[PDB]
Amino acid sequence: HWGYGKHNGPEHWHKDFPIAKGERQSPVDIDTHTAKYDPSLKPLSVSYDQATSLRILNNGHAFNVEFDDSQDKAVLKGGPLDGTYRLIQFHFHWGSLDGQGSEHTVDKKKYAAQLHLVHWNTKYGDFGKAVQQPDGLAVLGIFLKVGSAKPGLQKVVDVLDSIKTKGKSADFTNFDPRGLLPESLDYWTYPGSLTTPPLLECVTWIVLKEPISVSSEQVLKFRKLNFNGEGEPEELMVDNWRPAQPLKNRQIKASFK
Numbered sequence: 062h063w064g065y066g067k068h069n070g071p072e073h074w075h076k077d078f079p080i081a082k083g084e085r086q087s088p089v090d091i092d093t094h095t096a097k098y099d100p101s102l103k104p105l106s107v108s109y110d111q112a113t114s115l116r117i118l119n120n121g122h123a124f125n126v127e128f129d130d131s132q133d134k135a136v137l138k139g140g141p142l143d144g145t146y147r148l149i150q151f152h153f154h155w156g157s158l159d160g161q162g163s164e165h166t167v168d169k170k171k172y173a174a175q176l177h178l179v180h181w182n183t184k185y186g187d188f189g190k191a192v193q194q195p196d197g198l199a200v201l202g203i204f205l206k207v208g209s210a211k212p213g214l215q216k217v218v219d220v221l222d223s224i225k226t227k228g229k230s231a232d233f234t235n236f237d238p239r240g241l242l243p244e245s246l247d248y249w250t251y252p253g254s255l256t257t258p259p260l261l262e263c264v265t266w267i268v269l270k271e272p273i274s275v276s277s278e279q280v281l282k283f284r285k286l287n288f289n290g291e292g293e294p295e296e297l298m299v300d301n302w303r304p305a306q307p308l309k310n311r312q313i314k315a316s317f318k
């Protein structure tokens with residue numbers, strides 16, 4: 062079905078998901094000079110101290126770490142959000158080289174990878190209903206640049222061997238997502254969509270200004286993953302990112318000046 066190759070890549074997605082050419086598609090390029098500082102925007106409130114990770118899984122497009130979202134144990138609120146959003150999973154998008162990999166870009170600059178922490182608005186009851194609403198999800202986006210190792214990402218890096226191919230999964234408990242956060246929580250925000258099919262326009266994007274750095278050896282491990290299932294020809298999982306989409310009639314607000 063869909064993927065990131067030339068025959069099923071992002072340029073082909075519109076044929077099965079017409080909304081690919083919609084009005085609030087993601088990702089986008091963040092032009093730092095036309096972004097509007099908005100002093101009425103509140104600080105983000107990330108409460109991940111009760112977070113419960115359960116499993117890590119290679120879904121053939123990326124790898125996801127899933128959390129128990131049966132109760133308000135890891136939530137996001139504040140910022141441009143109203144209500145509570147529960148963390149359901151986080152995943153990454155990365156490139157084949159260090160100069161590409163992120164989905165969002167800042168003044169056209171691409172980062173080595175991009176981490177997405179996905180949350181759904183609890184007023185909707187479950188994830189499936191939330192994706193059907195304009196204010197259903199809140200995704201926290203964090204850029205990764207190659208530099209020094211991120212201690213808090215190593216646990217994730219070491220388990221990849223066990224989920225090398227599509228469909229593989231592994232128990233992944235007691236992982237603390239707080240170890241992936243940059244020091245500052247300043248951000249840009251705009252209304253957008255999921256960056257993979259079905260590309261629903263149900264997301265309030267919150268992109269952090271400050272990147273976290275990971276080491277070259279850490280990102281290398283990501284690139285060893287496979288898109289294919291076991292027993293199939295090896296297709297390295299790299300460049301699983303969608304290019305920037307037209308901003309159209311949207312404004313990017315910044316929480317800092």
Ligand SMILES: CC(=O)Nc1nnc(S(N)(=O)=O)s1
Pocket residue numbers: 149150177179200254255256257258
């Ligand atoms: C279960 C789930 O989170 N679905 C998603 N699909 N694309 C997403 S992204 N790239 O916009 O964060 S999240």
Ligand SMILES: [Zn+2]
Pocket residue numbers: 152153154177256
């Ligand atoms: Zn994503």
